[model samples]
Target: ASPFRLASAGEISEVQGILRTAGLLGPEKRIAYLGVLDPARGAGSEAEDRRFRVFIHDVSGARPQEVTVSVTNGTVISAVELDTAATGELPVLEEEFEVVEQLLATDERWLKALAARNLDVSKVRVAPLSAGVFEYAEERGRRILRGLAFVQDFPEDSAWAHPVDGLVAYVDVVSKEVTRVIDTGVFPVPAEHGNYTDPELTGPLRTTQKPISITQPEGPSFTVTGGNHIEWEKWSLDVGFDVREGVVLHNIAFRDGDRLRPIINRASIAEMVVPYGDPSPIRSWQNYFDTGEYLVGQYANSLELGCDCLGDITYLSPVISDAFGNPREIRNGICMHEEDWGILAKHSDLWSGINYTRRNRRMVISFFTTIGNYDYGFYWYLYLDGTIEFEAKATGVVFTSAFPEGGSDNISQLAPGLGAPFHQHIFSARLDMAIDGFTNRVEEEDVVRQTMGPGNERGNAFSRKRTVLTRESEAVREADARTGRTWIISNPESKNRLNEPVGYKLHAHNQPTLLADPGSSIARRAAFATKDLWVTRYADDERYPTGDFVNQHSGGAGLPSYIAQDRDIDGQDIVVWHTFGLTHFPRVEDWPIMPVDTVGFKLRPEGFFDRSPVLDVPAN
Candidate 1:
C-alpha cells in the first residue's frame, strides 16, 4: 500500500528501472529508500524475507529545502536534507573565488577592478601556478599545474587576506622572497580543523616519507572478547610524502566483513585544552532535543530523520564546484550501506544522482581532517548481505622537532588568531562496533601507539612517535542517536599529551617543563608547541599569554567537562571550535604557493556481500 513496497531484489530492480526511465536518476544526485519501516525495529518482524531502505545525496546548501518523491505506486515520501549547518560548515568556499575570478575576467583585472571600485590592487598578487591536477590525484596521467594559486601574501596569523583554512604563504612576485606574517586576529579557535606543523617554524616541515608501516593488533584478533566483536578489519597504505612541509599522505583500507559504521564524539580545539586547575573534561553534542521542531524533516546540522539526503544548504563555492562538484560538497550524508571516493571508479552509481538501496554489506572510507574544517572524510559502499565495513583516517598535523627533551614552559603558542595544524601521527587506529538488533553500539579508540613496525620493542621509538602523533589531534564524532530524528555528533576539543581519564584530571605531568614531557613521547616533545593548541577563556592575568592557556600550561580538567553527562547543546551535536596559532615561522621558498598537501581518510566495506551483488542488479 505504500509508495515504495518491501520486496525482493527483482521487484526493487523492476521499480528502479521504471524510475530511471522516468528520469528520476537524472544528472542530479540520486536518492535511495530505506524500508517502509526500519528493518532493525518497528513493524514487519520477519527474519528471512527481503526489506527496503532509501537515501539521496550530492545536492545544494546555504539555503536548503525539503523534497517530495513519488514511489512506483504513486505514493510520496517526504525527504529533508542533511548538510552544512553542522560540524563541517561551508562559508564562502566558492563565492570568494568568484569574487577573484570576476576580477580575472575581461579587461577588469585586479588593478582595473580596484581602480573601478577605488580599492587597493598594488598589494594583491595572484600566484602564477593556476589550477593543476595534483600529480598523485590527477587521473588523466598528465602533469599539468593548472589551478591558479593565490596567496594574499599575508602573515602566518593574518585573519584578513588569508584562506579561511589551511597554511598561508606570501610572495614578492619580483624577488620571489617569502616573508612569514602572523594574523594576530585569526589565531586558533577550538572548532577549526588544521594540520599540525612546526608551530614554531614558518613553513611545513616538508619531510615527505611513505607513512612508516606499523603493526598493531586489536584485542583478541580473531574473536570478539570482552563482549565486543571484530566489527571491522582494516589495512592502511602510505601513498606519498611531503614531510618537511609537515604533511603525510596515506590511506587506511579495509578487508571484507560485516560491520557497523561507528559514530564518534570529538572535542573541539577549545574543549581539548585544560585550564591550570579546572576539571579535565570533554564536551559532547549528540542530540537535537531543542524546540522539538519535529526536526524529522529539517535539513541543516544533523542527519534528516529516516532519509538519505546530503547537505541542507549550499554555500555556493564556484571554486569547489569547478573542481569536485556535488560529490565533494554534498559528500556522504546518505548511503545504501557505505561508500568510498577512490572506489568511485567501480561503483559509478554515486555520480548519477540516484538514491542507493540499503544492502546488507557495505564499505566505508573516512579520510581524517582532509576537507576544510570538517572532522573526518567519510564515504560508503553498499553490499548485498547485511554486513557493512567502514574505513577512516586522521587529519591534523603533529610535529616532532628540535624542542628540548624537557623544553621551556613559557607556553608561547596559546593565543587565538594563530592557525592550527592537522597532521598528527596516528599511533594506533582501531574501531569496535556492536549491533544489538535495532541498536548499534560503536566505540573508537585513539590511544597512543608505537610508530615503528610491531617487531621493534624500542622505548625511544615509541616515545618519538607519540610526541609527533599528539602534536595535533583530529576532531571525532561524539554520538549518533539512531532513535527518533537521527543526529551525528562531534566533540570540539583536541589537545596534546591529554587523554580522557576517570575523573577528568590531567595525565602525564611527570615532565618537568609544560612544553616537554619526557614521560611522554619524544616526537611530541618540542622546543615550542606550535600546532594544535587552543584557548578556552581570556580572563586577564588568570590566563596569561593567550589568556591562561588551558590543559597546556597549568593542567586541569579537559574542556567541555567530560563530567557533563548531557550531550546536546541547543540542537547541536556535530560541532567544532576555532584553533590558535603559534609564533611565525616562514621559509623563503613560500614566496609563492608551496606544494599542496591534503589530509583525509576513507571508509570501506567489510564482509559486505557474500558475493558480488552489483553484478546481480538487472541491467537497465
Candidate 2:
C-alpha cells in the first residue's frame, strides 16, 4: 500500500481535531504545516496507508511541536515537542507580515529614520525580509524578520524601484516588538515610477510583434484523475503540492509494453538559497531560504489561460491549511499540458530514397510562485524517449540597492545609481529513485582519457569509467567539467537485454556552489549546496536538505545531519540529491523587469530500455 496520496481536507480537519482534543493546540497556537506522515520501510498502519503529521507553532512561547494522528481510526499516533533555539525556532506566518507594520507604527527609531530622510512615513512600505543567522546577542534566539524600507508614490506603484536604502528594522514576530533599528547612512532614492504594466505611462506598446496563439481543436492528449493523478502518452505520475516545497511529483513511471516500469518514487526541489555578494551593511545579510523561510507554495499564483500556459491545460487546485488550521485553495496551482518538442528522430536515407522522421512531444507539469522581489516557475518535462527534466525559470524585478559613492565590483549597475548585487540561486532536487525496484545504487560515470604514455599509443583513446558509491560518506561528489561527470542510479538485480544493470543517468549542469566563505553563517546553513551530488540510504524522515525547521535556526543540520550516520548504501534502497544553480550578475537591461533565466538538469535512460522507446510513434 502506498502512503503517497496527499492528505485530504477531511483528513486534515480530523488531525487538527485530535490535536485540539489532546490540548496540543490552543488559541495562541497555530498550524504551520500539515501533510502525510512519511515512514521508513516498516510494518504498521502507516505501511497500510493511514497517518498525518501536523506541525504546530505555539507563538505565545515560540514553541514548535509535531503531532502524528491516524485519520482512519481517529487516534493520536505520536507527538514530540521540538523546543530548542538551535533548530526549533518557529517559521514565518502569513499574518506576521502585517505584524511588522503594526510594530513599526509605534517604534520611534523607525519613524525617526524616515523623518531624517524627509520621506512620507504613510507611503513607505516595510518588507519583512528573512533575518539570517548571526551571533548577535540581542537576536540570538529571537524569532525575527528584518524590515527594509521601500516607498510607494501611488497605491498601485511598484515599491521596489524607490527603495529607501540603508535603513533596517528588526522585529521579533512572536513578541510583536521592534527589537532594533539599524541604519547605514541614508542615500537618495531613485525617481523611476517603475510601473512596467502601465501602457499609458510608456506611451504605447510595440506593434511590430504579432500575436501568437496556440489551439488544440481536437482536444488534449492527456488525462487527469483524482485532482492530481496524470496519465499521458507512456507516462503516469501523481502531482503533489507542499506548503513549503511547492510542487512534488510522486510514483513516476513509464508504461513499456504491458508492464509499467517505475523510474522515480518521489521527487521535489527540497530547498534553495539566494545569497547575495554585496557586503554593504544594508545588503550584507541577504541570504534567503525562499522555500523554507517564506513558504513559496503558500504564495503560488492562480494561473490564467493565455498568460501562464498555451494550447490545452488541465489545472489542479490544491488545498492548503491557513495559519489557523483552516483549509484554503489555490485555484489552478498546478498546470499540465503537452508541448510539441521538435523532432524525436529523423533520417533521410539516400540509398533507400526514403525519409523517416518522428515528431517529439513532451508532457509539461509546472507551477509558479512569487516570493517578494522574485518570481519562479518550476517545470517538469516528461518526453516519449524515457527522459525526465526539471527546469527553474526566474524572471522578476531584480532586488536593488543604491550604489556606494566609490562603487565596488560586487554590485552590477542596473540603472544610473541603482545597483543589483551578484547572487547565486542554488537549488537541490531530492530524487527517491526506484530504477527497477527499491534496492538501487548510484555509480559515478566519467570519461577517462589516456595519456601519451605506454597505455596510449596515439593519445586519443578515452574510456568510460564507472565507480559505485558504496556508502553515504563516499557519495559527496562534485561535477567535473573536464571529465563530463554524470551519475547513474542502477538496480543490481534488474538486467537488460545485454545483462547490464538498468539505470537512469543524471546530467548535472556544472555551476558554482555557495559563494560564501566556509566560516560564514550561510555557508554552514546552506551546506547542502557545497557539493553537486549526494547519495544517502533511503530514510523516510529525511525529506528536506535544509533540515526540518529552516526559519531562524543555527547551522549544523540538514544534509550534514543525514550523512553523519554514514550508513551503507551499496545495493540498498537509496536516494540521490543533485544540486543545480545559476550565478546571476544583473545587466543594465534587467531594470524594471528581468527576462527569464533558466537552469536545471536531466535524467535520461541509460541501459534502462533495450531499444529506442519512441520507435513505435507514428509520424504527423
Candidate 3:
C-alpha cells in the first residue's frame, strides 16, 4: 500500500507484453518508460484503485508524440495523448548511443573531417555528451531529441589519458544524422601515460603499507529491524527514495531516556545546480540543474562491498525505473555503517597533571549517484552526541570542452588541450523540523562585535543578536560570514533544565552564491541558488525545488513559484531550505580525474539536551 513500493519486475514485464499485444509496441510507437500509479490512501472501492502508467513515444514520423497508457491487471484501460513536453521521459539508451558511435566510424565525411586533422576515426574513441541545446532547438523552431559526440584519441597503453580536443559533433536522435560539427583544428593532445602514483605527482607517502583494521568487538552497536526501519543506538528513522532527490529520510526520532523525541519529520536534497562559466556557445550554456534534469535516484549507482564502504556495512536497494518505465531494484543503492568520529572532547589540567579524552562515533547512511561525468556521494550522519550532519562529495571527470588554444582568461588548462572552466556546484536541502512537536519557530542568531562607543569601550567585545522570525517573507535569510549569522529551529514550549528552549542550530559552510547576473537566463532558471537559506510553510506538493517537470523547463516553476505567495510561516509547521556549494577555479592537477571535493552542513543540539549526550561513553 505504500507509495514507495515501486512496480515490481514481474509487473513491468506483464505490462510490456500487454502493450505489445495491443499493437502499441511496434516500430512506430514503443514504450518509453513505466512509473507507478499510486493508489488512493483513503478507504475506496476496489475498482477505483489505479495501476501502472505507461509512457509510449511515437517516433515513427518527424514529430514525436507521447502516449500515456493506464494498465491494470495486464489490461490496457485507457490511452490518451498528453503534451509532448509535459514529462522528460526520454533517456538515450546505451544501444541507441552505440548506434551513433558506429555511424561515426563508418561516416566518411565525419572521418574525413577528423583525417584532415591527422586523426583516424577507426582508431579513435567516441563518448556521448548530454544534449544541452534546448535553447538552440527553440531558436530553430523545432522539437527534436538531440545528442552530442566527442572524439577521443586511442592511447597506446592501458592508461586513460587520451585527451579529447579534436572534433565535437551534434546529432539528431530520430534519424541518427550528424546535425553540426565543430572542429578545434588541433591535433589531439597525447597526455603522458603513467599512473601518476610517484612521490612527485602523488605527494609524499603518508601511510605505511601495512593494513589497518577496525573491529567492532561488540558486533556493531546497532540493529536494523524491519525492511526500512533502522535503529542505531538511540536514533531511529525510515529511509525512502524519490526519482529526483536520491535519499529521503522520514520520522527521525532521538531517544531521550525512556521517551523518543521527534527531531525532523523529513529531509532531502531538494535540488542541485552546476553552472559553468564560459561565454562560448558550447560551454556557456552549461548551467545544469542535475536533480531536476536527470533524476539522481534513477541513476543511483550500486555500491560495492569494500570498495564503496568499509567496516560492517548494511545495504538498502532502491526501486528505480528503466527506460521503458519498468521498475528495477538497484542493489546496494544505499549503505549504512558506523565510523570512528575521532575525538568527542578533551581536557587537561597542568596543576593536577592529569588529562582526559573521549572517543566519538557516528552512524552514517550514504549513497552515490553519477550525473553525467561527475559522481556525487550523499551522506546522512547521526552522532553519539545527538548531532546530525549532511555531507556531499563531488569527484570524477571534470566536464571539459575542446579548447585548442588551451587556458584563456576565463578558463584554466587541466591538460594540454583540455580547458577546465570555472564552475559552481551548489546543492539545496529541504529540512522539515518537527523538533519535539510540529509547532516550531526559527530564530536567527548573529554574533556582532560591539563598537568602541559602548560603556565598556572595548572593540574586542561581542554580543549575540537573536531575532525570532514571525513571517514567511522575513524568514528567507542568507548566510553572512561577517556577522556569523545562523538559524535555530526552536520549540519554545519545550524547555531544558536551564529553562532554555530546546532547539537545533543549523550551520552551513563553504563558497559564495551564484556569480551569474541576476537577470541572466541561468540565474533565473535556478533562482533557488541565489540565496543560501529559505523557510516556508509545509506543503506536501512543494517538494522539488525545480518543480516536478524540469527536463527542458524555461524557468519559473520550482522555488520561485512556491514562495511567490509568501504564505504564513510564523509558528506554523515549517520547512527550512539550505544551500551550500563550491566555486571551482580549475587547477592543472585536476585533469583526467579530479580529487574528491567535499561540502557539508550540520545540525547540532542547542539546549535540546540537558548535558553532553555522549558523556556516558566509556573512555577508550
Candidate 4:
C-alpha cells in the first residue's frame, strides 16, 4: 500500500556502487548531494513521502561532467554536461534497488566538488511542499489555490498565503535555503489580472434598487456602449447546499438561519446561460448570485451566470509529456486558465463593470490580470461629458526577465536591486485611453424632446442626451500630474526608452466608459479621454536575481547577474505573458470548457496628457 518505502543511507549505496562499477559515471567520477524532495504530501502518511536529489560529476580531465541521481534508491537517473542549465522540466528516474554502498561513487564525487567549490552541505537542504490543486494561470500574480497545513480550513477560498501542511514550499540554489514559498495570489483585488470569479461582496444587483435594466452591450468586444448606475438598500440571503444526482445543489435553506430569497417587484440579474442550449453545464463555483430563478435573456429555466468552467486551465505535466523526456506540469504551460467565463455572459448584467476612480501615488504602477479563462474587452471612457473611449486588451503568456535564468533578482542582495523571485508569474497590461472632460447637459426637457421627435426616437435620445460636467481647463491639470518633457508621441512602435521605467508611472482608475461608433467615420482610433487613462505596473516574482523562485533549496544564489553573459538557448527575443484568475464577466457560451484566446493592446499618449502622472502626484 505504500507508494515507496523509506530507504536507509546504506540501502542507497549498494545500487550507486553497482552503477559506478557498471561505468555509468565513466572514470574518475564524483557525486554531489543536491537537496531533499517530498513526493508524497506528508512524511510517512498517505500524504507523505520524501525523495533526495544528487548530482554525479564524471571528471578525470576535460571539462567536468554532470548527472542526476535519486537518493531514495541511489540510482544514476540523469547525466549531462556539468555546465548544462536546468529547465522547467525535471530529469528522469531510475528503477528500484535492494541495497546501496556507503562510500559509493556518487557520494564520493560530491564530496570533492563541495570541497573544490568551497560549498557547505548543511545549508543546502531544501524541501518543496506541494501546492495541491493550485492555479498558475496567466494574469494572476502566481496564486496557490488550496487549503494548506497551516490554517484550520486551509483551503477555503482564502486570499492570504497560508501554511499548507507543516512543510511549506520554497526555492533553493546550490544548497542554502533562501526565500520561503509565498502564495503570489495578489492579496487584494487591484492586483488581479482581469475580472474573475463572482463576488460575495460585489455584483450587479448589489446596488440597483427597484426594477433597473442597466444597459448591457455585446459584440466581439465589450466597448461599454452605454451604462447607468443604481442605488440599492442592502439585502441579505440565507443559503445552503443539497446533493442531487451526483451534483451539489444550492438551496435557500429555510430551516437554517440563512435568509430566504426576497420577493420584490424589481429583481434583475445578469448571468451566462445556454441561450441556444448548453454544450456542457457548470456545477460549483467560488461564488454565485441569484435572481430568484427568473427569466434571464432567452432562457426560461433557472438561469445562472458564472465565470469559466471548473478545470480547463490546469497543470499539463500530470497529463502531457514533452519531447525532452520532461514531465510537463501545469507550471510548464504557456498559461493556465480556470473555466469561469461560461455563466457570466448571458445577461450582460451590470454586476462586473468595475466603476471606480484611481489616483496613483506608488511610483511603481502594475497592470493586473485576472485568473480564469475568458477575454476582457474593456473600454476606458473619460468624461466630464466630452467623452472618449479606449479599448483595453490582455493576452495570456509567460513573463520572464532578460536577466536570464527566467527569474527576477532576490530581495536580500539589493546589489542587483531587489528582484521578486522566479517561481511566481507576473501580470502585464495595456490601457486604451480616451480624451475628453465634458460633453453636454442632462435637462429633463431634452429627454422628452428627443423621444417625441422621431419614430422610436424617444428611446434612442432618451438616454443618449449628453451634458458638460467640467468647463475648467485647470480641472485636467488638477486631476493628474505632469508627464516629463519627453516627446509625447515618439515612435510607439519602437522600443520605448520610458519602457525602462526609471521612476514612476500612472494608469486609469475606474474601468473606462465605452462609446459606440454611431457609424461615425471619426471613430477610427479607439479614443479615450486623458482623465480616463490610468497607469499599471508591478514586480512580484519569487526571486528577482537569485535564480531560485524563492524555494531556496539552492540557498540564495548570490544575485551576481547570471544573465550578464548568458543568452537564450537559441539567441532570440523571448516574449512572455501571464493572467490572474478573475470571473467578473462570464458567459454561458463559455460552458464546460471556456474558449480562451491571447489578447493584448498597446496605448500611446499623443498630445494627450503631460509627463508621468505618478511623478507629478508627489509622494506623501
* Best model number under lDDT: 2
Model 4 spans > 4 angstroms off: 1-149, 154-602, 605-620
Q: Which ten residues in a row have the lowest lDDT in candidate 4?
A: 240-249
What is the C-alpha local distance difference test score of candidate 4? 0.22
TM per candidate comes to: 0.26, 0.96, 0.83, 0.21
lDDT of candidate 1 vs native? Answer: 0.23
Number of the top-ranking candidate, with TM-score as the measure: 2
Separately for all candidates shown, the number of backbone clashes (residues 3 or more apart, or on different chains) is 172, 0, 4, 142
Runs in model 1 with CA error above 4 Å?
A: 1-40, 43-64, 68-76, 79-365, 373-620
578: Cα error in model 2, Å: 0.8
Better of 1 and 3 by TM-score: 3
Lowest summed lDDT window (length 10), candidate 2: 38-47
lDDT string, candidate 1, 391-443, tens digits: 32222222111111232232112223322121221111111111111122111
lDDT of 1 at 88: 16
Report the Cα lDDT for candidate 2.
0.85
Ranked candidates (TM-score, high to low) = 2, 3, 1, 4
- The models' CA-based lDDT, in order, is 0.23, 0.85, 0.71, 0.22
Quality of model 3 by C-alpha lDDT: 0.71
lDDT of 4 by residue, 1-620 (tens): 22222223333454355445656544454442222332422224654333433344323323333444554445566555433222111111111000011111134443343344333433222212212111233212221111112111222332211211112222222222222333322111111111223353235554545552322232111111111111111111111110000000011011111322211111111111101011111101011000101111111112112222112222111111122122222221111221111121122336886543323210000111222221222222221111122233333321111111233222111112111111111112221111111111111111223445647744654332322222222111112213211111121222224452111112223221222233321111111111232111111221122222211011112122222233221111111111111211323322213344322222233322233222222222
Per-residue CA lDDT of model 3 for 514-585, tens digit only, reads 888998877877778888888888886677777654544556767788887777766678889888898988
RMSD after CA superposition, every candidate: 21.5, 1.9, 4.7, 26.5
> Candidate 2's residue-wise lDDT over 488-541, tens digit each?
999999999999999999998898888789999888889998999998888777
